[PDB]
Design an enzyme around this catalytic site. Structure first.
Site, short mmCIF file in Angstrom:
data_model
loop_
_atom_site.label_atom_id
_atom_site.label_comp_id
_atom_site.label_asym_id
_atom_site.label_seq_id
_atom_site.Cartn_x
_atom_site.Cartn_y
_atom_site.Cartn_z
N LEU M 42 58.01 32.90 27.20
CA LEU M 42 58.03 34.23 26.45
C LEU M 42 58.80 34.01 25.09
CD1 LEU M 42 58.76 36.60 29.45
CD2 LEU M 42 56.73 36.74 28.30
N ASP M 43 58.57 35.07 24.35
CA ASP M 43 59.62 35.21 23.05
C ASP M 43 60.50 36.25 22.84
OD1 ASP M 43 56.78 36.29 23.18
OD2 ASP M 43 56.98 36.78 20.98
N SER M 44 61.14 36.33 22.14
CA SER M 44 62.42 37.27 21.74
C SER M 44 61.86 38.75 22.13
CB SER M 44 63.27 36.83 20.64
OG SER M 44 62.54 36.97 19.41
N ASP M 46 59.42 39.89 23.30
CA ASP M 46 59.26 40.16 24.77
C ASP M 46 60.26 40.62 25.70
OD1 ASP M 46 56.51 39.77 23.82
OD2 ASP M 46 56.19 38.08 25.08
N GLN M 47 61.42 39.87 25.61
CA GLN M 47 62.72 40.08 26.19
C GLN M 47 63.19 41.42 25.59
OE1 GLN M 47 65.79 39.75 24.52
NE2 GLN M 47 67.43 39.60 26.03
#
Ligand SMILES: CCCCCCCCCCCCCCCCCC(=O)OC[C@H](COP(=O)([O-])OCC(O)COP(=O)([O-])OC[C@@H](COC(=O)CCCCCCCCCCCCCCCCC)OC(=O)CCCCCCCCCCCCCCCCC)OC(=O)CCCCCCCCCCCCCCCCC
Ligand SMILES: CCCCCCCCCCCCCCCCCC(=O)OC[C@H](COP(=O)([O-])OCC(O)COP(=O)([O-])OC[C@@H](COC(=O)CCCCCCCCCCCCCCCCC)OC(=O)CCCCCCCCCCCCCCCCC)OC(=O)CCCCCCCCCCCCCCCCC
Ligand SMILES: CCCCCCCCCCCCCCCCCC(=O)OC[C@H](COP(=O)(O)OCCN)OC(=O)CCCCCCCCCCCCCCCCC
Ligand SMILES: CCCCCCCCCCCCCCCCCC(=O)OC[C@H](COP(=O)(O)OCCN)OC(=O)CCCCCCCCCCCCCCCCC
Lengths: 115, 202, 157, 178, 60, 51, 459, 171, 126, 12, 102, 15, 88
Positions: M42-44, M46-47
């Site tokens: 995932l990427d930021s 998405d966090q």
């Protein structure tokens, strides 16, 4: 209403001003006039403790109404016929006032076409 | 209200009482509100009154219907927006008995009073149809207009910050400016001119 | 006597060494120390901080003085007694001061203007005044009985 | 709340917080969840488009243009979680958050009703009195002499030692005490 | 003891308040003053036995 | 006192103070009325003010 | 009157000849008993004021002040026991003797038929007060405060002495019964105007005025709790009593020599009530509120109407009680943290729940919450002024607003808000200080129940 | 108990009940219940207390002060005559206040009993009020908080001077 | 229609060009500030957590605030043509205004009173 | 389940 | 002149009883919310009677209870004006407060 | 007396 | 105070629920100690949404300075537990 569209525009001069009514004498027409009769006497309305706002030639049906309301307690749903009579007389008084208003309006039209 | 959703299905009793309240607030003939607001509207539209006041009062009755419907919509007719865990309980008799007493009131009390009171003033009871039925017309048009506006905001177009709503959403800016201009002057004067300049200095 | 005169405020700093000592006293970075202009109004070496309230602080940070949103040794704004959250707010607004005032006062002035308009152009009914009996109730309304009223008479039309 | 912000804010953090605020204000406009999902996919598309833009001059310019656009068409009355700054129940329970030392003034009569609790309390207080000096020296001996500090606390490196400055994080009154 | 609150909180207070009223407030002048009761044509005043004549007959 | 029932919220004490302030601005007119009636009628009772 | 004064004297040998441990109890109890004895002056069953001798008397104006002065002594003694606990026995006895001498001299001043005894004692009340301030105050500004307090008063009083001697040489006596029946219109002239100034400015500096009021906050701030109490409650009332007594012989020059002072008072009311907003020191806040309140007394006395004198007497009594109470409340928290700043301790309703009700009730009496007598005075003064000029209510009302504002600010930022968790030294409330607040408050309830006592000669 | 000639109270002509229905009036029966339950024990307590009063009965009188020369009959500087005259003037002043209060009370009570018709039926009380107020004004008004007999005398004298000069003139 | 700041409605620091700065001098300043603030935070917490503490925590910044707003004023006050004029007006302007107000109102009143034409029907108490 | 509620000393 | 006034005053007596208890040691044991709700309910039921008597005869009273202080030429008393307004509002407010208490 | 459900519509009491 | 008290196991179950309902994740390879950017690819951005969903689920808000530090769902659980004073 439309009594305002005829005054505030389109010849204000020939429409009545509510503050000054009547602005013509009562004898301008109606050769004789039965001055309105008031059934109730001052003492009746004083004893029944009415308000100055309520003594307007329709106080006798109002007195019958208050008497009915007193006698028919706690049956506050009774006295509905007397309410209708008071409302009727007040409606007739309002009709007479409308009549005065329209009478003055029509008299103004005369001064327009007489000149 | 954005996180309330449907409340009929999940709180039928509270919802019915809320609808009764909103109706009484509006005209809804023969409830408590009617027996006053009707005669209010009649007296105002049947007396030598300022026309602007009359006009904005009728507009405001329409808006009454409007935001009553706003509540009824975003709180009683849409689909949920509240968290997924449900801890709802409205069965406690302390919650139901007072509300239903107030409901009996909201329904019958105006009739009861208006029929038991003495006749104080003289109501004008002979006016055109379009004045005796005007409060109801107003409230109904408000209901319809709000219903349409909301069924529209259900769509997939993007709402915007129109200048005529930021004025309503923000109390007309009255607080936003007064509550920080008048105390600013007051409290800066009290220090500079009153306390230091005179008492501590001059 | 807990704090010494070398730790209290004093006269305007004119030597940059004194400015350094003041910004150190006040636990301030020298480059970020601005004393009030020397007008003779009583400030002295006391810092001049930005005219921002305590709403604009981070409301999450575990401030030491959580209600004022200040920290222990932080310099206190001269006007903090006013810029607390119970008082004046200088927070940014979604709309600008000027636009807000314009809209508000335009609304109010338009309302007053239309009130005067509707006053000149009232809304009445096509009806005449209300005819009261007994000389518009002169005996009532507090009229001298011994003196006779003015005969205002009303007819049946 | 639990962490202390850094000296300055990086660029990625700025972008993430703009993303968060934008999505929240958009939820506030897009009240219905489907509408919100749709326009949020659109917003993520708008972000991810300039995601591999390597230059910084144009990156900061895009960021500032986005901040401007966000300040515009900004919900004046956005959703604010009740227990959060600006919410209904923000500090509604901060009046029942009586600290612990208010018990050192309790009357032995009030205490005899909760004996086990106060035995435990004296145990805790002994724990603290013992760990104090050790954590103090642990702090003074591992301060970077570079001269710049960070506001973050160290853990208990040595075994048997308690983490420095814990009596106020621990013993912290609950968040809904009634 | 179904609703003894009624007695304990209404009856005794009524006793003391009736005492106060009837023997202090009354028995003092212009303490209780009642708007005169409505009298109507057709009624029968009690003390004087007077009979208010009815109203003149309506033309309607 | 009731608005400020939760005296940890610095936003409830603000509202309570607000209400106090506005209702005192009204108290000013109330007191003006009391004074006028005490000087021009000599009584604060309604039965005597009615004249 | 001797039956009230000689016991107050024997209190001194009771103070000194008593064992170090039982010295406080005895004096406190017997002072309470003397406050009781002073309640016979209220036995006035006629319009003929009480003359006990050629020197001592008590009218409806002096009786409330005498009772208040006899009742404040035990409260001061109590308030003065937490400090002085570490001082030597002799110092404690000396403090108690200062307080007793103040009581005695004040009862004399209020009982005096002649103005020279009044002046001698009016001035003698400077020695014990100055001693209390400068010897038992805590900071270094003690001394400048005492200096201001001495010399404002003396520079004001000397002309008063000259004018009293002039009146003596012209009339034959400074008796107050004689100077009221044997009176003559004062021809309007610059000489008689300067006579008015001389007769008034001493009291005006003691009320005080707005332009000359800097001696009061310095003192209150730097004075121990007892000095603050007696000062605020009595040593200001002294000037109003003097003006009320001496304004009979200054007629009609009071009609046009008052505008300056009425005006200064009405405006300084606003100025001081506004200061009470941007004020870090709680004691300074209380002092400036006292000034704002005494401005009304000055204006009222200047217009000299019956409603005016009545409202002034009621406001004097009520303000004395409530200001003594507020200073007690402030010193309560001071004894814990040893700071006078109103910003340090700002969540004290979560620790002292009962003591907050005292704060609430006092700040409600500070402002005009009815049916308090703090309100009846303000109301009748407002009415008198409105009759004077219908444009006074503007300033009166903005003062009302500011008053509510700063009283609410006090109690909010002191009691309400988030507690200061680092204040581990916030010991619970002492039964003694709680009794103190109770004794300050209950008499307000009782007076509100029976206001006929604190009206004055006019009613 | 209290004099009618001082606090007059008209006879209150009361109307008789005219029930015109079959439902019961819940007030007459509640009233009988309240009587039987409250007025009887209270009336008994009162009988007992009045009997205990009759036993060990006590009397008290009204203080009559004789008339003493007014200040007109006193000399400038004679403080004895002046003291007596001034105490008298204060007595009479308090009495005049209480008279004005009696009249205000009569006016209030009249207005309350009349109700809507108080402009009528309540003009005699208002007239007495106007009269005594004119008098009070002309004999006690513009004195300061230090009102005495000499000030009232000077006020009377200036008034009589102005009136005598308005009468001499125009003659 | 973009935001225009005001002394009350300020700039949200997201439209300020001083936050969108990567300049190393600015970042060195920020770091120095964080260092000072952390130093003070530790100095405060070492007392807030000292279990051998029986008294409150003295704040010298507050002491300086109060000493400056009350006692450091007059020494650091020198008269000026602006100070003197503001003081003169603030002191003797409202007084003059209200004096003429009251004087005119009361002269008009007393004129009507001596003359007549002003009625006080039921004024009894004044 | 039940928990100790912290409170000041209300004995005095 | 007796029943009406009796009730008009007993209403205040009832509203006060809870508060006088709150300054007593009973409040520790008794359930104060239920007590107050019951007192309000009974005050409302009692107030229903003045309302009936006014609906019937439409008479309104002026009731002076306690003479506080006579200031020269101006008396102050605790006088009550039980007109249509006061009685109806009393009953309505008491109903609503009875509900709010629960 | 209720059963707090998760993501589901709960049953209602007849009352 | 009508809501059932919060318990760790329930927190974990609901977090893993919310996560399984995230289409960019495979339920099979999901557990605590799993990292969003490294184990779950995932990427930021998405966090951010992950934490938003945690908020909307539990009904409160998590600041960005702390949210930035939440990568393993056990960190989310421990944060939600330290905020709501759960101990079992
Ligand atoms: C007012 C002026 C006061 C100026 C301030 C002086 C001062 O600072 O006080 C000293 C103070 C020094 O404190 P200290 O060292 O503890 O005093 C010990 C000294 O040796 C001095 O004290 P001492 O221990 O040496 O003396 C012992 C003596 C204590 O006596 C004293 O030494 C001090 C007495 C000073 C007179 C205070 C009376 C005030 C009257 C006001 C009215 O104990 C007694 O036996 C008391 C007997 C009575 C002494 C006379 C008191 C006045 C008589 C009043 C009538 C009552 C009796 C009949 O400073
Ligand atoms: C017609 C015109 C009639 C005039 C109508 C006046 C309208 C003005 C309304 C003012 C409202 C002010 C207000 O909000 O009251 C706060 C206050 C609330 O107290 P709180 O916030 O619960 O504080 C409790 C503490 O935290 C901790 O206390 P606690 O929770 O343990 O509960 C114990 C109980 C206290 O229990 C006691 O032991 C009290 C014993 C007092 C006996 C002394 C009576 C004085 C006369 C005896 C001679 O409550 C208190 O602590 C209050 C006692 C301190 C105040 C002294 C009592 C005031 C008596 C006034 C009558 O209201 C009351 O409950 C006290 C009575 C109502 C206050 C009236 C005071 C003004 C009197 C005007 C005459
Ligand atoms: C026709 C006649 C109609 C009358 C028209 C009057 C029109 C004026 C109406 C407003 C007058 C008062 C304005 C001040 C109100 C105020 O400041 O109090 C509220 C304010 C809270 O600010 P807020 O924006 O609500 O922040 C909450 C965050 N959610 O709280 C604060 O920030 C400060 C509160 C404490 C300090 C208040 C300022 C000092 C006292 C000022 C006294 C004078 C103000 C009134 C003057 C008017 C006199 C006529
Ligand atoms: C409760 C507080 C009521 C406050 C109003 C005063 C009424 C009580 C009262 O004073 O009556 C006492 C009465 C003697 O009164 P009296 O002789 O006329 O004059 C006293 C001179 N010192 O002594 C008696 O007659 C004894 C009779 C029993 C005690 C009085 C019964 C209760 C009176 C309640 C009536 C007022 C209720 C309304 C008050 C609250 C309204 C906010």
């Amino acid at each position: 209403g439309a009594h305002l569209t005829r005054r505030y525009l389109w010849d204000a001069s020939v429409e009545p001003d509510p503050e000054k009514i009547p602005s013509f004498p009562p004898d301008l027409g109606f050769p004789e006039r039965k001055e309105r009769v008031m059934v109730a006497t001052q003492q009746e309305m004083m004893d029944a403790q009415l308000t100055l706002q309520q003594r307007d030639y329709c106080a006798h049906y109002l007195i019958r109404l208050l008497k009915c309301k007193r006698d028919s307690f706690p049956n506050f749903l009774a006295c509905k016929h007397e309410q209708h009579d008071w409302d009727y007389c007040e409606h007739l008084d309002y009709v007479k006032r409308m009549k005065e208003f329209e009478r003055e309006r029509r008299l103004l039209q005369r001064k327009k076409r007489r000149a | 209200i954005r996180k309330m959703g449907n409340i009929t299905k999940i709180m039928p009793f509270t919802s019915s009482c809320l609808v009764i309240g909103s109706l009484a607030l509006t005209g809804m003939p023969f409830l408590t509100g009617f027996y006053s607001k009707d005669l209010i509207i009649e007296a105002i539209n049947t007396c030598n009154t300022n026309a602007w006041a009359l006009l904005i009062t009728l507009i405001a009755t329409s808006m009454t219907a409007m935001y009553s419907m706003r509540i009824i919509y975003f709180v009683t007719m849409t689909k949920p927006r509240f968290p997924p865990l449900i801890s709802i309980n409205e069965n406690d008799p302390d919650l139901m008995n007072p509300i239903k007493r107030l409901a009996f009131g909201s329904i019958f009390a105006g009739f009861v009073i208006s029929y038991n009171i003495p006749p104080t003033s003289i109501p004008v009871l002979t006016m055109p149809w379009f004045l005796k039925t005007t409060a109801l017309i107003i409230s109904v048009l408000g209901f319809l207009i709000a219903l349409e506006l909301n069924n529209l905001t259900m769509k997939l177009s993007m709402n915007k910050a129109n200048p005529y709503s930021s004025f309503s959403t923000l109390l007309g800016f009255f607080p936003s400016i007064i509550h920080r201009i008048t105390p600013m002057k007051s409290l800066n004067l009290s220090l500079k001119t009153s306390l230091t300049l005179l008492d501590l200095i001059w | 006597f807990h704090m010494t005169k070398d730790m209290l405020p004093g006269s305007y700093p004119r030597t940059p060494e004194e400015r350094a000592a003041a910004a150190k006293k006040y636990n301030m970075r020298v480059e970020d120390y601005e004393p009030y202009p020397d007008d003779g109004m009583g400030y002295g070496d006391y810092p001049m901080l930005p005219n921002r309230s305590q709403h604009e602080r981070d409301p999450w940070y575990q401030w030491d003085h959580s209600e004022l949103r200040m920290n222990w040794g932080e310099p206190i704004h001269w006007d903090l007694d006013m810029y607390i959250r119970n008082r004046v707010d200088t927070s940014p607004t979604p709309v600008s001061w000027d636009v807000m005032c314009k809209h508000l006062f335009g609304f109010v002035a338009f309302m007053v203007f239309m009130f005067w308009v509707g006053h000149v152009f009232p809304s009445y009914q096509p009806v005449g005044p209300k005819q009261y009996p007994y000389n518009n109730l002169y005996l009532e309304r507090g009229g001298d009985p011994t003196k006779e009223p003015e005969p205002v008479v009303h007819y049946d039309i | 709340a639990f962490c202390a912000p850094p000296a300055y804010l990086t660029h990625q953090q700025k972008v993430l917080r703009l993303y968060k605020r934008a999505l929240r204000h958009l939820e506030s406009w897009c009240i219905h969840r489907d509408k919100y999902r749709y326009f949020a996919c659109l917003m993520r598309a708008r972000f991810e488009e300039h995601k591999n833009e390597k230059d910084m001059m144009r990156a900061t310019q895009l960021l500032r243009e986005a901040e401007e656009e966000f300040w515009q068409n900004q919900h004046p009355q956005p959703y604010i979680f009740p227990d959060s700054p600006g919410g209904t129940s923000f500090e509604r329970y901060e009046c029942y958050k009586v600290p612990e030392w208010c018990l050192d003034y309790w009357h032995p009569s009030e205490k005899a009703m909760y004996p086990d609790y106060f035995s435990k309390r004296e145990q805790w207080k002994k724990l603290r009195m013992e760990s104090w000096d050790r954590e103090v020296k642990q702090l003074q001996e591992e301060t970077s002499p570079d001269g710049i500090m960070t506001e973050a606390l160290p853990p208990a490196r040595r075994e048997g030692d308690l983490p420095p400055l814990w009596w106020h994080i621990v013993t912290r009154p609950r968040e809904r005490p009634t | 003891r179904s609703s003894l609150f009624a007695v304990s909180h209404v009856l005794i207070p009524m006793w003391f308040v009736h005492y106060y009223v009837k023997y202090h407030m009354a028995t003092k002048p212009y303490t209780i003053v009642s708007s005169k009761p409505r009298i109507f044509p057709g009624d029968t005043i009690l003390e004087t036995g007077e009979v208010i004549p009815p109203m003149r007959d309506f033309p309607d | 006192l009731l608005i400020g029932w939760w005296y940890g919220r610095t936003d409830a004490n603000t509202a309570a103070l607000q209400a106090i302030l506005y209702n005192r601005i009204g108290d000013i007119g109330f007191i003006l009325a009391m004074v006028w009636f005490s000087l021009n009628m000599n009584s604060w009772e309604l039965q005597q003010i009615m004249f | 009157m001797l039956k009230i004064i000689l016991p107050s004297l024997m209190l001194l040998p009771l103070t000194w000849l008593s064992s170090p441990k039982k010295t406080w109890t005895n004096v406190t109890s017997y002072s309470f008993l003397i406050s009781l004895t002073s309640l016979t002056l209220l036995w006035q069953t006629d319009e003929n004021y009480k003359n006990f001798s050629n020197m001592f008397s008590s009218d409806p104006l002096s009786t409330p002040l005498i009772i208040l002065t006899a009742w404040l002594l035990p409260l001061m003694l109590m308030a003065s026991q937490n400090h002085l606990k570490k001082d030597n026995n002799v110092l404690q006895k000396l403090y108690i003797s200062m307080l007793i001498s103040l009581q005695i001299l004040l009862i004399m001043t209020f009982s005096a038929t002649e103005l020279i005894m009044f002046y001698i004692l009016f001035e003698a009340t400077l020695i014990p007060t100055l001693i209390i301030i400068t010897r038992w105050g805590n900071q270094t500004e003690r001394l400048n405060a005492g200096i201001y307090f001495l010399f404002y008063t003396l520079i004001g009083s000397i002309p008063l002495l000259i004018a009293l001697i002039l009146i003596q040489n012209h009339v034959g006596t400074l008796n107050l019964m004689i100077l009221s029946f044997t009176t003559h219109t004062l021809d309007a002239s610059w000489s008689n105007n300067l006579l008015w100034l001389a007769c008034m400015m001493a009291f005006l500096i003691k009320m005080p005025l707005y332009g000359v009021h800097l001696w009061l906050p310095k003192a209150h701030v730097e004075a121990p709790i007892a000095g603050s109490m007696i000062l605020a409650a009595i040593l200001l009332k002294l000037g109003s009593y003097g003006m009320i007594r001496i304004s009979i012989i200054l007629d009609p020059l009071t009609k046009y020599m008052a505008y300056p002072f009425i005006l200064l008072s009405l405006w300084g009311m606003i100025m001081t009530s506004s200061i009470c907003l941007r004020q870090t020191d709680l004691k300074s806040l209380i002092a400036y509120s006292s000034v704002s309140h005494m401005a009304l007394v000055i204006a009222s006395i200047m217009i000299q109407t019956p409603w005016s004198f009545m409202g002034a007497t009621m406001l004097m009594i009520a303000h004395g009680l409530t200001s003594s109470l507020l200073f007690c409340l402030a010193n309560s928290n001071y004894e814990r943290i040893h700071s006078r700043t109103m910003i340090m301790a700002r969540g004290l309703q979560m620790v002292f729940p009962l003591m907050a009700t005292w704060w609430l009730m006092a700040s409600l009496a500070n402002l005009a919450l009815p049916p308090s007598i703090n309100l009846m005075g303000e109301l009748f003064i407002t009415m008198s002024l409105f009759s004077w000029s219908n444009f006074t209510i503007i300033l009166m009302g903005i003062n009302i607003i500011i008053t509510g504002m700063y009283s609410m600010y006090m109690i909010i930022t002191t009691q309400r808000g988030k507690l200061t968790n680092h204040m581990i030294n916030l010991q619970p409330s002492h039964t003694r200080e709680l009794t103190l607040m109770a004794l300050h408050m209950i008499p307000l309830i009782l007076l509100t129940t029976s206001p006929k006592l604190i009206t004055g000669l006019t009613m | 108990s209290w004099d009618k000639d001082v606090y007059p109270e008209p006879p209150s002509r009361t109307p008789a009940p005219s029930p015109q229905t079959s439902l019961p009036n819940p007030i007459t029966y509640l009233t009988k219940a309240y009587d039987l339950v409250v007025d009887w024990p209270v009336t008994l307590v009162r009988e007992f207390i009045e009997r205990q009063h009759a036993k060990n009965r006590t009397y008290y009188y009204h203080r009559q002060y004789r008339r003493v020369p007014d200040i007109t009959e006193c000399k400038e500087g004679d403080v004895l005559c002046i003291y007596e005259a001034e105490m008298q003037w204060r007595r009479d002043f308090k009495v005049d206040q209480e008279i004005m209060n009696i009249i205000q009370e009569r006016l209030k009570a009249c207005q309350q009993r009349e109700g809507e018709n108080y402009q009528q039926n309540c003009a005699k009380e208002l007239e007495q009020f106007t009269k005594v107020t004119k008098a009070y004004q002309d004999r006690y008004l513009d004195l300061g908080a230090y009102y005495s007999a000499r000030k009232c005398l000077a006020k009377q004298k200036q008034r009589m001077l102005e009136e005598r000069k308005a009468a001499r003139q125009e003659a | 229609s973009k935001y225009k700041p005001a002394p009350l409605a300020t700039l949200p620091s997201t439209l300020d060009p001083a936050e969108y700065d990567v300049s190393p001098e600015t970042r060195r300043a920020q770091v120095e500030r964080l260092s000072i603030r952390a130093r003070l935070k530790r100095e405060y917490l070492l007392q807030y957590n000292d279990p051998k503490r029986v008294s409150h925590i003295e704040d010298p910044a507050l002491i300086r605030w109060t000493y400056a707003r009350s006692a450091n004023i007059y020494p650091n006050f020198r008269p000026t043509p602006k100070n003197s004029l503001l003081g003169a007006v603030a002191g003797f302007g409202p007084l003059i205004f209200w004096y003429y107000v009251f004087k005119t109102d009361r002269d008009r009143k007393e004129r009507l009173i001596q003359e007549g034409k002003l009625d006080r029907k039921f004024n009894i108490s004044y | 389940k039940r928990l100790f509620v912290v409170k000041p000393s209300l004995y005095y | 002149m007796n029943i009406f006034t009796t009730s008009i005053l007993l209403i205040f007596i009832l509203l006060l009883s809870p508060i006088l208890i709150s300054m007593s040691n009973l409040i520790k044991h008794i359930n104060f919310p239920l007590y107050t709700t019951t007192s309000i309910k009974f005050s409302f039921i009692i107030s229903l009677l003045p309302l009936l008597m006014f609906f019937h005869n439409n008479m309104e009273y002026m009731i002076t209870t306690w003479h506080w202080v006579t200031m020269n030429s101006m008396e102050l008393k605790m006088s009550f004006k039980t007109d249509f307004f006061s009685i109806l509002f009393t009953s309505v407010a008491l109903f609503v407060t009875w509900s709010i208490m629960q | 007396h209720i059963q707090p459900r998760y993501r589901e519509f709960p049953q209602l009491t007849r009352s | 105070s009508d809501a059932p008290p919060l318990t760790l196991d329930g927190i974990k179950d609901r977090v893993l629920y919310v996560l399984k309902l995230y289409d960019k994740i495979d339920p099979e390879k999901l557990s605590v100690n799993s990292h969003f950017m490294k184990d779950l690819g995932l990427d930021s951005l998405d966090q951010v949404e992950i934490i938003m969903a945690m908020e909307d689920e539990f009904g409160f808000e998590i600041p960005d300075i702390d949210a930035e530090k939440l990568m393993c769902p056990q960190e989310i659980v421990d944060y939600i537990a330290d905020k709501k004073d759960v101990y079992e």
